[PDB]
Amino acid sequence: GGCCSHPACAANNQDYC
C-alpha cells in the first residue's frame, strides 16, 4: 500500500513521491 513502492506510480504522483 504505497505509491512510491511502484516506480510508475511514483512518477505519476510527484507530490507523493
From Swiss-Prot:
Homology family: Belongs to the conotoxin A superfamily.
PTM comment, free text: C-terminal amidation, in synergy with sulfation, is important for activity and structure stability. Non-amidated conotoxins has a 1.9-fold lower inhibitory potency on alpha-3-beta-2/CHRNA3-CHRNB2 nAChRs (IC(50)=0.54 nM), and a 4.8-fold lower inhibitory potency on alpha-7/CHRNA7 nAChRs (IC(50)=367 nM), when compared to sulfated conotoxin.
MF terms in GO: acetylcholine receptor inhibitor activity; ion channel regulator activity; toxin activity
Keyword Zinc part of the UniProt annotation: no
InterPro entries: Conotoxin_a-typ_CS
Presence of keyword Oxidoreductase: no
Keywords: Acetylcholine receptor inhibiting toxin, Amidation, Disulfide bond, Ion channel impairing toxin, Neurotoxin, Postsynaptic neurotoxin, Secreted, Sulfation, Toxin
Free-text note on domains in this protein's UniProt record: The cysteine framework is I (CC-C-C). Alpha4/7 pattern.
Coiled coil: none
Modified residues (Sulfotyrosine): 16
Cystine residue pairs: 3-9, 4-17
GO cellular component, one term: host cell postsynaptic membrane
Protein name, entry field: Alpha-conotoxin AnIB
Location of the region described as Ser-Xaa-Pro motif, crucial for potent interaction with nAChR in the Swiss-Prot/TrEMBL record: 5-7
Chief location: secreted
Tissue specificity annotation: Expressed by the venom duct.
Location(s) in or outside the cell: Secreted
Entry-annotated residues carrying Cysteine amide: 17
Highest taxon listed in the record's lineage: Eukaryota
